[PDB]
Design a binder for this molecule. Structure first.
Ligand SMILES: [Ca+2]
Ligand SMILES: [Ca+2]
Ligand SMILES: [Ca+2]
Lengths: 148, 148, 148
């Protein structure tokens, strides 16, 4: 939908069960480049939601538009007020759907290949593989290249 | 004062009291872009000062000139010798003053919004908000954009 | 040998003895820019080798060619299969030799200057000094500048 990088992002919080625990994967993907930020969180409150969002902005750049579901994360005042403070238009109107599946496929794989290493390690490996290793044909460019 | 990014930086070490403890905030701001690096340190010796400076170079790039106060951090031989080794002109001749206040305002806010999270978390959130979220009108550009 | 950044990399695993322990330094250097990634690892198995390699790609970009020795790290199926999966040509055919020496000289220095700080700290300081502080005359550019 986005015509350039950081025109329109999509965001979701999805659960990822691991070692008997359901983490909250905050996921931010750019709709033009496909570049992704992912944060693993214990909770889903406005602190973690804003913290996951800032981190995505840290890696990708500041977006103009963001689209999310009606999850409790993206309906809290704190988050809405955050977005209006820094001139980020936010609609609660799939790409994040597919992106979640890709991310989790890589997590499951990296945790299987290396069962003793932490979950943070597997998320870095998954992010780095998706953004900078996967060549998004036919352009030959990776998501990271197209974004920057 | 700087005509381009990394022409002239300013640097300061300021105290930030939190949970009964005074940390040393090493602060490096570029005088053209306004882009900032901040490191929280327990001490202010040449190890931490050089370590905070390298980190600023890690994020911003290598500067030609740096201006600091006569604090003990920027008068030690180790630091002076460091600067002369890597061709960085250093004068001990406000922007860092205002930058410290902005940084601390964000720290106080993020620690208030999320009292249970560590101080490192709040510093990342503060840095990311300042460099990449704040739009420095009238250009519409953020500090990070103008720097890179 | 590389005509551009990320055309041809060289990679090595070398030992670095510190505090009675031999770490495995995975080292990835670009043959055109001289830009370097270094990861400290306890082991040398395919998990750590791929993890160190992804991190190098994370910082530098995806390479087309990589050249390594016949070390057990770069002969494992897991690593070979990894490379063929993501379209990275890998030969087991010096720059990494000199790069290892430079890196270790900086490690020895930073550990001497600051004996109480962790080894991770010294590796960051060494990497940042090499990539972004050292001016690679006569161009005046640093390795990081030439790479990006
Ligand atoms: Ca959801
Ligand atoms: Ca001071
Ligand atoms: Ca070797």
């Amino acid at each position: 939908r986005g015509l350039l990088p950081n025109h329109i992002w999509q965001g979701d919080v999805t659960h990822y069960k691991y070692k008997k625990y359901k983490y909250c994967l905050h996921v931010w993907v750019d709709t033009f480049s496909g570049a992704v930020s992912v944060s693993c969180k214990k909770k889903e409150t406005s602190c973690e939601t804003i913290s996951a969002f800032l981190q995505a902005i840290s890696l990708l750049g500041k977006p103009l538009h963001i689209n999310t579901d009606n999850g409790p994360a993206f309906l809290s005042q704190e988050f809405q007020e955050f977005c209006t403070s820094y001139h980020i238009k936010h609609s609660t109107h799939g790409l994040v759907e597919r992106t979640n599946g890709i991310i989790k496929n890589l997590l499951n794989k990296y945790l299987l290949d290396c069962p003793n290493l932490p979950l943070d390690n597997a998320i870095n490996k998954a992010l780095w593989t998706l953004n900078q290793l996967n060549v998004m044909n036919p352009s030959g460019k990776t998501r990271w290249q197209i974004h920057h």
